[PDB]
Design a binder for this molecule. Structure first.
Ligand SMILES: Cc1cc2nc3c(=O)[nH]c(=O)nc-3n(C[C@H](O)[C@H](O)[C@H](O)COP(=O)(O)OP(=O)(O)OC[C@H]3O[C@@H](n4cnc5c(N)ncnc54)[C@H](O)[C@@H]3O)c2cc1C
Lengths: 666, 133
């Protein structure tokens, strides 16, 4: 869309309606009469626009009111209320902007932030922007977390997040303006290449693909229409449902052949009985002929009964011969109708093998996109975040996505090599205990009014705990941590000295030999300037391959690629790197997924802050002290960068409302 | 709303396949057995039908009597009357057959004859006789 509605959309908001968030802060307005709502909205969308039109400079309340026209700049408190709400909730002046009003001399409140992820950094910038005093603690020796970007010489390749899943409503759109990421569209065209090394032909490719997509809509039908969501007191997975569907699809193929042959045999039984009828007519006729012969051999002159005998038998015979001719006509029909049938049989099979393996690749691609075996996705919910998908082509960061955390990191008090071991949060404030990753005898204590925790779900799930909560997290929280899924997927980076692949193709698939190994090296991206090929391990494979030497893995790749392009064309690689995310102790996996047995709800539970009980008993209810952000906290944009980035924006808003109060609500 | 076209799934079939871990294989084997058991069964009746086709070799051409194409003529000679009376004894009221025997009489003049002479040839007695058979 265009103009002010463009901004509402590009900010993930309905242009013609106030959101629940807005209702909460402007209850006067939304309980109020329609007219004021439209004003409020326009003022909102308009302000958004202005920010969006130029996100490299802070948008001030002044600049905003300045640019509004009447009737709308008549209410200059409303304008401020709105402008201030947007600023708080990071819908404007987020990311990296030129500050017009240099920072408040003196800072209010102290926050310790765990993890220099994107979620961490985006929060920390805001809070700093809001005057708070913020320090980030990061176990690693660099920012970004799961935004990791390999660099040697001109080689540059992302071992974590590399795609920008569309700019229509994506905050990263804004950030790309504020930071030079070299965004290159990805050409979706991906040719597959069987186990052997031979391209799959168009005909198959499309037959199979369409079956894939058909199979999915199928699963949906089971789930919503047939309510196939529990089975033997356990929640149904996408995988289960897919098998079931495939089963039924086979069962039908057979069921049809059956009723086809049942028609053959039944038509044979027609033909048989007619042949007996015909062979016995043969008999009577042959004989009746004799008698006519004999009667006719008696010579005239005959008396009449003997004359009659001839004529009688003559007719009786022509009669039967007629009957036989008729049946020979009928026979000719059943005989040819019998030939139509064994000429036109139903489908031999549901899917060959060669296809059912190609189909297995369409599954690896799904397991790769969800970082998990489809045995583990919720049937009902794996795709709940679908409605919120952005618009536009997907893109890559061509100079490496790390450019972003690094940008965000700029100006922040980040402590690297600092691994939190314990988080204590009391009615009167919190202390965080950390150690130096390098020498762990060295201990640090950090006191603060609030803690924002961006620890990965993997890290939260860890048993025994890498991080201790004192007091323990309430069971409502810890269950959501079990219930949720934290998946895995790895990348192998192949740096070469020359391009031996098709440069007009960005990505291309390899089809695995088995179902159980459709993960291994099933896809290759060619996305960077330098001659680099990137190979994904998805599915049940990523898990296992983590236990295999790099050399082996790189071997297996060259294999695959030699098979595709010929042994003379596949040099050794100059440089290779291989991720092992599940092993990585500051990640313990790759990204969240909607486990079977979980719901989008759990993601909301993840974002609910924790409020310590009272110090002295009988003392009144405290403030919330412990806060959660990160990719697993954000129901509608989980497992992404933008979604983390947003979760971070969210918690900064919420923490400032808490500790700096919120003037805009009256 | 409805499964994509050519995808087939029923409450009963889904329930059916799910019941047990193996119910899937079980069900699909019966269908596989039951197929071969009809494929063989077609194999038989092929041979069997081919056997009886060997028995009808030649056809019935060698048994086709010569045809008589003699014109109608409604003048009843005495023997034609006699042929008729005998027909009744052999055919009952099948006046078509009877006319076929007589050779030059349509199917009516036969009914005619039937009711003209029905008294003088006792064609009622002749029918009662044919009947008791
Ligand atoms: C292989 C892979 C590919 C991906 N691809 C994409 C993609 O293509 N597109 C996309 O949109 N998203 C993608 N993602 C998801 C995206 O990278 C993450 O969702 C996002 O970076 C999350 O940031 P975060 O701040 O929530 O967590 P993180 O980025 O992990 O940050 C958390 C920080 O916590 C730190 N930490 C952990 N334990 C401690 C401790 N005890 N003390 C101190 N610090 C600690 C970690 O070192 C880390 O820096 C991908 C993820 C992976 C693994």
């Amino acid at each position: 869309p265009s103009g002010v509605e463009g901004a509402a959309f590009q900010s993930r908001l309905p242009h013609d309606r106030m959101t629940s968030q807005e209702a909460a802060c402007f209850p006067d307005i939304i309980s109020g009469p329609q007219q004021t709502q439209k004003v409020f909205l326009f003022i909102r969308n308009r302000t958004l626009q202005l920010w969006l039109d130029n996100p490299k400079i802070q948008l001030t309340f002044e600049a905003t009111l300045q640019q509004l026209e009447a009737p709308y700049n008549s209410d200059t408190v409303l304008v401020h209320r709105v402008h201030s709400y947007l600023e708080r909730h990071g819908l404007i002046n987020f990311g990296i902007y030129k500050r017009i009003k240099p920072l408040p001399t003196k800072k209010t409140g102290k926050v310790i932030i765990i993890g220099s992820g994107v979620s961490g950094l985006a929060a920390a910038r805001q809070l700093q922007s809001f005057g708070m005093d913020v320090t980030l603690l990061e176990a690693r020796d660099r920012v970004g977390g799961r935004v990791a970007t390999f660099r040697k010489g001109n080689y540059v390749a992302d071992l974590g997040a590399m795609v920008v899943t569309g700019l229509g409503g994506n905050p990263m759109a804004v950030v790309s303006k504020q930071v030079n990421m070299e965004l290159a569209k990805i050409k979706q065209k991906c040719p597959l290449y069987e186990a052997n090394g031979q391209a799959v032909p168009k005909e198959k490719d499309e037959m199979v693909e369409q079956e894939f997509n058909r199979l999915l809509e199928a699963t949906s039908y089971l789930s919503h229409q047939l309510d196939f969501n529990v089975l033997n007191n356990k929640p149904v997975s996408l995988g289960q449902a897919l098998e079931v569907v495939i089963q039924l699809q086979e069962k039908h193929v057979k069921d049809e052949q059956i009723e086809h042959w049942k028609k053959i045999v039944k038509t044979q039984e027609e033909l048989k009985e007619l042949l007996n009828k015909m062979v016995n007519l043969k008999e009577k006729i042959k004989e009746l002929h004799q008698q006519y012969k004999e009667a006719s051999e008696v010579k005239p002159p005959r008396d009449i009964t003997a004359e009659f005998l001839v004529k009688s038998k003559h007719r009786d015979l022509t009669a039967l011969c007629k009957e036989y001719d008729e049946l020979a006509e009928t026979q000719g029909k059943l005989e040819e109708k019998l030939q139509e049938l064994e000429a036109n049989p139903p489908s031999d099979v549901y899917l060959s093998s060669r296809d059912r393996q190609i189909l297995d690749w369409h599954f690896a691609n799904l397991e790769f996109a969800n970082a998990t075996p489809l045995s583990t996705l919720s049937l009902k919910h794996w795709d709940q975040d679908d409605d919120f998908e952005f618009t536009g082509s997907h893109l890559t960061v061509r100079n490496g996505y790390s450019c972003v955390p690094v940008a965000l990191a700029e100006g922040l008090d980040i402590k690297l090599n600092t691994a939190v071991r314990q988080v204590r949060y009391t009615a009167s404030g919190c202390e965080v205990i950390a150690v130096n990753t390098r020498s762990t005898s060295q201990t640090f204590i950090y006191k603060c009014d609030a803690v924002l925790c961006t620890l990965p779900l993997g890290v939260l799930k860890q048993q025994p705990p890498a991080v201790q909560f004192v007091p323990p997290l309430p069971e409502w929280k810890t269950s959501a941590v079990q219930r949720m899924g934290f998946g895995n997927l790895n990348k192998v980076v192949l740096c070469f000295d020359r391009v031996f692949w098709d440069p007009s193709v960005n990505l291309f698939g390899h089809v695995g030999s088995t179902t159980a190994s459709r993960g291994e090296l099933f896809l290759f991206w060619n996305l960077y300037k330098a001659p680099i090929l990137l190979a994904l391990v998805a599915g049940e494979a990523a898990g296992i391959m983590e236990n295999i030497s790099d050399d082996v893995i790189v071997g297996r790749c060259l294999a695959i690629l030699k098979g595709i392009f010929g042994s003379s064309a596949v040099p050794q690689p100059k440089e290779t790197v291989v991720s092992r995310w599940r092993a990585d102790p500051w990640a313990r996996g790759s990204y969240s997924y909607v486990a079977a047995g979980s719901s989008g709800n759990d993601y909301d539970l993840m974002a609910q802050p924790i409020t310590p009980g009272p110090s002295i008993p009988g003392a009144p209810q405290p403030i919330p002290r412990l806060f959660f952000a990160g990719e697993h906290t954000i129901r509608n944009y989980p497992a992404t960068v933008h979604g983390a980035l947003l979760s971070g924006l969210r918690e900064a808003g919420r923490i400032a409302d808490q500790f700096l109060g919120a003037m805009y609500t009256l | 709303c409805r499964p994509p076209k050519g995808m087939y799934l029923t409450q009963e079939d889904v329930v059916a396949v799910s019941c047990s871990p193996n119910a899937a294989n079980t069900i699909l084997r019966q269908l596989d057995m039951e197929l071969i058991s009809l494929k063989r069964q077609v194999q038989n009746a092929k041979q069997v039908n081919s056997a009886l086709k060997q028995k009808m070799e030649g056809g019935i051409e060698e048994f086709k009597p010569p045809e008589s194409n003699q014109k109608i003529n409604a003048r009843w000679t005495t023997e034609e009357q006699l042929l008729a009376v005998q027909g009744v004894r052999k055919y009952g009221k099948d006046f078509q057959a009877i006319a076929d025997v007589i050779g030059n009489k349509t199917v009516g003049q036969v009914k005619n004859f039937f009711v003209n002479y029905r008294r003088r040839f006792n064609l009622e007695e002749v029918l009662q006789e044919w009947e008791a058979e």
